[PDB]
Amino acid sequence: DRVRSMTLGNSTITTQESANVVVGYGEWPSYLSDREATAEDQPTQPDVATCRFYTLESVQWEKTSPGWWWKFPEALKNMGLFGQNMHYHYLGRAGYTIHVQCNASKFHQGCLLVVCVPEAEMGCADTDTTFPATELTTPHVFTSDSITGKKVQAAVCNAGMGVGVGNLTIFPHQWINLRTNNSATIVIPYINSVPMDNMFRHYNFTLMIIPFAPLNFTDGATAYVPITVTIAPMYAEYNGLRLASTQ
Amino acid sequence: DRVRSMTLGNSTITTQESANVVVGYGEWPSYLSDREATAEDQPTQPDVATCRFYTLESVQWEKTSPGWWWKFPEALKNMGLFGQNMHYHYLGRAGYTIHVQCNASKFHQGCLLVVCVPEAEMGCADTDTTFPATELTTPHVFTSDSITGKKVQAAVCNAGMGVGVGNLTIFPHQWINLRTNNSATIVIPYINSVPMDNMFRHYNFTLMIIPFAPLNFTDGATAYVPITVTIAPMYAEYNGLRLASTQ
Amino acid sequence: TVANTQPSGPSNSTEIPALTAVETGHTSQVDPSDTIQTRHVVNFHSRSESTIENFMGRAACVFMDQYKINSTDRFAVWTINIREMAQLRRKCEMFTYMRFDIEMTMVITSCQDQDMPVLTHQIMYVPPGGPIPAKVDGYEWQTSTNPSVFWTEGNAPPRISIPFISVGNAYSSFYDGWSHFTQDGTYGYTTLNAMGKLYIRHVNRSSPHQITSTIRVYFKPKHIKAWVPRPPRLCPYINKRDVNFVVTEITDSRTSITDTP
Amino acid sequence: TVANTQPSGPSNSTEIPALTAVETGHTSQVDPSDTIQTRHVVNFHSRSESTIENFMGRAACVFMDQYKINSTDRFAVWTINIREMAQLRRKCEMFTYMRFDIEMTMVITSCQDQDMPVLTHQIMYVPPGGPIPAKVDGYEWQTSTNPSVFWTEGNAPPRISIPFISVGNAYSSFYDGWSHFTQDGTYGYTTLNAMGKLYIRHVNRSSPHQITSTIRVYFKPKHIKAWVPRPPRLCPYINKRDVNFVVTEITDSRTSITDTP
Amino acid sequence: GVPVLNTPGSNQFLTSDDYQSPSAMPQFDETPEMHIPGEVRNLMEIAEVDSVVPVNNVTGKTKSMDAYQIPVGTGNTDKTKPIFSFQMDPGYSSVLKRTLLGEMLNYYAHWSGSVKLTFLFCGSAMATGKLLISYSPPGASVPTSRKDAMLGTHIVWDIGLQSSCVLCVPWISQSHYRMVQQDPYTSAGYITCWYQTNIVVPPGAPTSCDVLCFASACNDFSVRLLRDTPFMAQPGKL
Amino acid sequence: GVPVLNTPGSNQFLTSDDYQSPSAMPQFDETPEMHIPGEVRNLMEIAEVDSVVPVNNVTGKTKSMDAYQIPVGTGNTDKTKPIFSFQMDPGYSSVLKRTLLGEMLNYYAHWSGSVKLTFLFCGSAMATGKLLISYSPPGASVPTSRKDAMLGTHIVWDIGLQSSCVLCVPWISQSHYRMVQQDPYTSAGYITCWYQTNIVVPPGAPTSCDVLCFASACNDFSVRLLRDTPFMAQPGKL
Amino acid sequence: NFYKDAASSASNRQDIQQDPGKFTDPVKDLMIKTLPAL
Amino acid sequence: NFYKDAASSASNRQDIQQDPGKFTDPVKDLMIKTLPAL
Ligand SMILES: CCCCCCCCCCCCCCCC(=O)O
Ligand SMILES: CCCCCCCCCCCCCCCC(=O)O
Ligand SMILES: Nc1nc2[nH]cnc2c(=O)[nH]1
Ligand SMILES: Nc1nc2[nH]cnc2c(=O)[nH]1
């Protein structure tokens, strides 16, 4: 039960050392029902053009790297037809199979926390101002210090949202322990207070990858150990066609 | 369903381009019932002498004419036997088939609002006095300006009663669009807080004809385009015989 | 609840729901299911709070006046009407005829301009034609058949229920008509407003210092039936005994017909 | 009640309850019956007081402000939010989405900075977009459709119930998103907080001396449904319109990893 | 007698309460009920009635009749320019805040459902045309060309004998209700009109016509949270 | 009317009461209920979820990531010294007062049930070892040798493919509940860790590894007496 | 009902009735949504 | 229930429900306590 495969919309994912997929809060994503819907317009359901695996830019994991975060759905804009249906539609749902994968040898050690946090409302570096939208969204890095300026407070102990970073285990999450597994798959149903929401101005969840045990290896092992994020929306549907937004 | 005919008490009305008749609030007028009556005297019901079409004085519709209003039942005094039964009786009901008719060519344009407003309590031109009864009742004209004096405030935007003139669509009404129809027929049941009321001191409704799109035509078309109002009471009954009133 | 939206598909036929004629006096009954393609959605939305009982059924201030203790400024008089204050007037001048019975709630707050003992107030209602008091020791105040409320301060506000006391089958917000049969005298709804005066005084005989009480009457209509709706008032409320107005713009202006924020 | 402890004995087998893998995102479901030898004990302990209705169902202070009698300091205004005070904020910022309807209780205590007669207070709530008063003789205060509470001192505190008045299917404690569609303007939960202002004043017209009243609003959530739990707040609450923070130690320190008192 | 306990909320006056109170006039004989035509039992009955929309409310035309009529002409210039354009939210929009839909909507804080815009063409019987009336949900800017506007929920309206058309704005919203006041979170789209082809008129007919606009609610329309209207703005004693 | 008697407690405001109160917004139409994933109905659902325990919270490592990781090495020195040691009571203990178990426990005055400590080994796949994690109830001092610590409820944890182990602290208490605050009458025991054998690592693998600790509640865990948390400590107006 | 008088009663807020047919389509000849108006 | 409105009601403190399975073990493949994790 360590080997697993995920095939979505002409893109399959192979893993051979992995924990089983974690279904966020025990709910598998699905299309919006007729009783819980709010928009009387026929939604667009391109199941194979958008609901497929998209591979983000990989990041180098070093001995002193604090962590990273992505903000979805927005991070998936201008990527395939999933980003084109954002610009032309006003509403959207998805279910985001998140496949974070980081391989190593049996002579490397380290432990990542791959956690999906719904509504990770970040905090500004200077407590009396507001920071631009380019700060939130090459994933932004945490820092093992305290930054100052018109930035998101990207310290690691307070994970950006101002909590204990060890208490991020309450969210749907996995661990990549390099002796056990080299990938972590999290399935996230559509979590929001509203049945459909705009995908640009609203970040439904953020993906935080935080090494609790840092990477360590002796001389001779490969120093370049990259972390690759492969996110695939599921059961994505759109509503409210209009002219394309320039963003 | 564009041709229609109305025959009341030896007077018929022919129209060939018209919308269907509008029944005010979905109630057709009738005689007063025995359970909703208040006067224990045998009412006079001259169904053919009074319940017939009476044709008022026609008015010229120009490019800059603001509008007109009549006040009924009173406007129908000294007109036939319907006005004679006002002077000898103290109480009265009716149901007023209102047939406003304005014909044009296919090279004229314009759009009238023929609206019947129950209890169109007008407003005085100078806000601190009261105006005589000859101001309310050749129909009085609106003005596309602001008048001053001991007069009814006959501006058009505030239709005299101090509301938005576009919001007069809540009342029973039709439109005379010169490309579609050349007449507008409104049937008004007896609308009052009381089962019978005196016809002289009380104006049950007023007939407002307001051109939203003004009359327009090039040279050669007929400039004299008159608007004729043909009002016929229905189910009129009277109570309280006495000597004739001098008004 | 409100009507659900039925699912529709692509249509190409000789039927035309969008095509209407406004000049028929007819408002088109079309839904978004007729113009575009829709999904089936179940509307659990209700129209429970737009009803006339929920809309009008809130206590609105209708009268404020002062009356002092320790002349004619010693007591208050109102000659009941809705037209004293603008916000409830615009709700009642929205229907031509409306039939309701109201309960009134008084908020009586005494203020000093030496210590007041305790203040007890009397709100006496004389129906039309009754004897009016011209003094606080009037003799009218004894209420043999006039309804009256005695209230001492520091308690709950005095709420009593009133029936539908109109002569006609409904109250008339508007009366396009005259008072006399010769079309003379008072014009408008003032002629119909025959509801008695309301007299409020301190039943305390006197006071060592000048105390000025103010009363606030709050009508809340209930068991409401309304007929013949009419548009809401646009221009303000210059008078109380007549619908007189200065002409005002129908809507806020823009710079162009295309201009939009 | 909570689960009883089943009796176990000495075990020597190829099954391993203690051996787990945390990296599966899985919390082990083992009991002390799996690791050691246990006796049968009947647990009559219940989890009745750890539920969300019992945890959140206590009236917490959410607003304090002064307003004086006898300008704009004559009345108070709150523009309703939970974020005014820290203790109830940390309970509500513990769940991402939560759906509840609340009753509010006011504690109004007038204090003198010559004798006050009696003080009657008005707490008027305007839903968002309504007319705001800029004065005590505003004209806004008459509450034709605004809810309002009139309270004279020396009585029970004014408690009224409020429904779930949110536009969305739940209140959102956190909103990781922007106000405008171009990702601009206001960031955070402030955008979602559209609940009307709360206006409090003395309905007493004036006073012979300066009287300063203070109001204390106590929300108590009831009929509570909470979704998506999140960790409690570590660092303090610098702002009210944003979750901004100074970085703080995660836990109190020790001198050594073995060091213990 | 029976032991009672006074809870909070005693001896208060909540204006929106439902309590029984002693009658001031006991055994009162009310006037017998009579049938008056046109009983309204719900305010969404009188918000679903059409009302002319002052679309041309430019500076200098509001206190007149020219506010209601939309100028539509026959020419070669400015056929790639909108005929009109305004906000779709009927509460704060400076065009349809005063309609019967907007007057009954400003007593409320929340609103849901589809609104529909009816366009009466007030030209001559010989003048024909085609118009594109489009609705575009928010998220992007206002459509500046007819190409960008025909991507929203539009209708191409041929002008003939019927002479009237209904654009049903289909209620594409994220939430179940929207704020009547103007806030970014719940803002309605844009209603723009364009020339599909042109207005074509015979030699003797007047070449400048105008479209008259209407707006009302659909059958799934509802208002949700009572508040006071901001329009009246009493200054003082009457 | 009916004679009543006002008892004590009338006209008071008890904050934790259960009374009915008049609705400010009568006949309000709430937003229809929707299914949001992850509904929590009890706070012991979210105290039974694991959370990383800052065991290495020495001075200078708390405001960092090194607070969570427990240094475990391969050597000849200090193999008769504990790896860690801390109080078992999750309310006042300076190690696990901040965990999700300790955050939800500090809103309460009394607590009952078994807690369990899960230890994730974050070394290489070739490095193997054995560890003794022991719990000793109070009454004696802290165990100072592995001989004294293997007399309590311990577990010898072989480190291999599973790489994780759960020490269930078995709730050995005199009473049914314990105080969350620190008092002598109801004080929990001690959790010490020892080297059973050693950590053995191949020549090329890194010789310094670290164990990562977890803590959560069992299914028989309950909290009993609501109080305010001491952590927030508001200083003034925000 | 603790009082005999009918005006001394609670407001009947619960009932929800409506007849929008007497305002939106008060016409005599029935007009079908599908068919043309004239 | 002395009021018609549902928000004007007592707090439903009595009910005690819980589903800790959606937080502690949200995994797809069922994990037995007895068996090894992998
Ligand atoms: C102390 C006794 C108080 C009795 C007060 C009686 C109040 C009379 C009823 C109120 C009049 C309502 C008139 C409404 C007319 C309209 O709607 O235009
Ligand atoms: C006198 C009338 C008083 C009416 C007061 C209405 C109060 C509005 C409801 C409270 C808002 C609750 C918002 C919670 C949002 C969150 O949990 O973050
Ligand atoms: N493939 C798949 N479909 C589902 N539908 C509901 N649950 C599931 C699941 O767990 N897996
Ligand atoms: N002729 C005629 N008589 C009626 N009696 C009741 N309704 C009607 C109607 O619509 N037409």
Numbering used by the authors:
A (entry chain B), B (entry chain B): 11 to 147, 151 to 260
C (entry chain A), D (entry chain A): 7 to 76, 81 to 123, 130 to 277
E (entry chain C), F (entry chain C): 1 to 238
G (entry chain D), H (entry chain D): 31 to 68
Task: Reproduce passages from the article.
Viruses from the family Picornaviridae form non-enveloped icosahedral virions that are about 30 nm in diameter. The capsid proteins VP1, VP2, VP3, and VP4 originating from a single polyprotein form a protomer, the basic building block of the icosahedral capsid. The entire capsid consists of 60 such protomers, arranged in 12 pentamer units. Here we show that the exit of the RNA from the particles of echoviruses 18 and 30 requires capsid opening and results in a loss of up to three adjacent capsid protein pentamers.
We did not detect native echovirus 18 virions that lacked pentamers at neutral pH. The electron density of the genomes is distributed uniformly in echovirus 18 virions at neutral pH, but transforms to a grainy appearance in activated particles at acidic pH. The inter-pentamer contacts of 11,000 Å2 in native echovirus 18 virion are reduced to 5400 Å2 in the activated particles. Correspondingly, the interaction between two pentamers in an activated particle of echovirus 18 is 25% weaker than that in a native virion. Comparing the cryo-EM images of native virions with activated particles of echovirus 18, as well as other enteroviruses, reveals that their genomic RNAs undergo conformational changes upon exposure to acidic pH.
